[PDB]
Amino acid sequence: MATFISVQLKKTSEVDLAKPLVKFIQQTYPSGGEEQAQYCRAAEELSKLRRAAVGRPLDKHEGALETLLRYYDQICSIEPKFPFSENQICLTFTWKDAFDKGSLFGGSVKLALASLGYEKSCVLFNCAALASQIAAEQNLDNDEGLKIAAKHYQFASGAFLHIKETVLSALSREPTVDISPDTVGTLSLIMLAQAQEVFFLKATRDKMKDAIIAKLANQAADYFGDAFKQCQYKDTLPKEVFPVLAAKHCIMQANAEYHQSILAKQQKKFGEEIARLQHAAELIKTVASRYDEYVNVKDFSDKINRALAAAKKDNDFIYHDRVPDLKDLDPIGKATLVKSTPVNVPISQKFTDLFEKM
């Protein structure tokens, strides 16, 4: 279908990374044509690497992400050498906010800083955003799609969370909102929610126990629920985000209850089955009327209604189980298969620091 949330990449203007880095090499590097004027072609190499990571109208592929990741690893490796205190270091990175259009009354929202902390913050944001795009793009009724989407969602979650913990110490100023701890904390939870939904979807495909699927769905409802609560009083993220999180919260509760009801029927608890099915129907009716424009809930509602109609029919004419109230049923349990991937450099596949010997 279409309904996963992904993140648009921030834009930068191009900058000459080499030229300023060239002027610093004349240090414990004396004569011409040596490590001296080799490192300058590695600085020539790294400036070229920035334009590939950040300059190109992008590619939602293994290739483009790896470029970004490499560019992140490479910056991280370059700080403990150059502007460790910098009284001038003539080099300034400019980034547009990912979300804030600005106002067509006076242009976009941008922020220029002469800081490697700023730069790597925005790059990492973009590694996260491209990962969510690749993740969202994947075919979920195919097994390696499921795995690529769960891997990238957890990466993107871990990467957003790394910026939250790190943006402020990393920077000179109050950041743009897109990378400020609160937005990126929320983006972190969304990606983790989506990761878990992918693990629920995979469980449904591995045709696992309904008991385990209910717990995985219940866990997701919590991730989506927390996330939409973080968005309730705020209008930073694209406007589709909060309604998708709201629906996805009720959808996952409805999956939890539907699967738990199947278990209940297996155990001949026919009243419990109707109760849990009534709850699922209600959750889904709510999402259908309230969130029409964002999710398509029809097949799942029909599935629930047939099961409810058959349950009621046999119970009234055969079993006569008392249908319990919701508050009298045990909580459905919770299980997570999902974690925010720590950012430990190198995050790129076959990392070569172009300035290893320095």
UniProtKB/Swiss-Prot annotation:
<feature type="modified residue" description="N6-acetyllysine">
    <location>
        <position position="215"/>
    </location>
</feature>
<feature type="modified residue" description="N-acetylalanine">
    <location>
        <position position="2"/>
    </location>
</feature>
<comment type="function">
    <text>(Microbial infection) Involved in HIV-1 virus budding. Can replace TSG101 it its role of supporting HIV-1 release; this function requires the interaction with CHMP4B. The ESCRT machinery also functions in topologically equivalent membrane fission events, such as enveloped virus budding (HIV-1 and other lentiviruses).</text>
</comment>
<feature type="domain" description="BRO1">
    <location>
        <begin position="3"/>
        <end position="358"/>
    </location>
</feature>
<protein>
    <recommendedName>
        <fullName>Programmed cell death 6-interacting protein</fullName>
    </recommendedName>
</protein>
<comment type="subunit">
    <text>(Microbial infection) Interacts with HIV-1 p6. Interacts with HIV-1 p9.</text>
</comment>
<comment type="subunit">
    <text>Self-associates. Interacts with SH3KBP1/CIN85. Interacts with PDCD6 in a calcium -dependent manner. Interacts with TSG101 in a calcium-dependent manner; PDCD6IP homooligomerization may be required for TSG101-binding. Interacts with SGSM3. Directly interacts with CHMP4A, CHMP4B and CHMP4C. Directly interacts with CEP55 in a 1:2 stoechiometry. The interaction with CEP55 is required for PDCD6IP targeting to the midbody. May interact with PDGFRB. Interacts with SH3GL1 and SH3GL2/endophilin-1. Forms a complex with SDCBP and SDC2. Found in a complex with F-actin, TJP1/ZO-1 and PARD3.</text>
</comment>
<comment type="function">
    <text>Multifunctional protein involved in endocytosis, multivesicular body biogenesis, membrane repair, cytokinesis, apoptosis and maintenance of tight junction integrity. Class E VPS protein involved in concentration and sorting of cargo proteins of the multivesicular body (MVB) for incorporation into intralumenal vesicles (ILVs) that are generated by invagination and scission from the limiting membrane of the endosome. Binds to the phospholipid lysobisphosphatidic acid (LBPA) which is abundant in MVBs internal membranes.</text>
</comment>
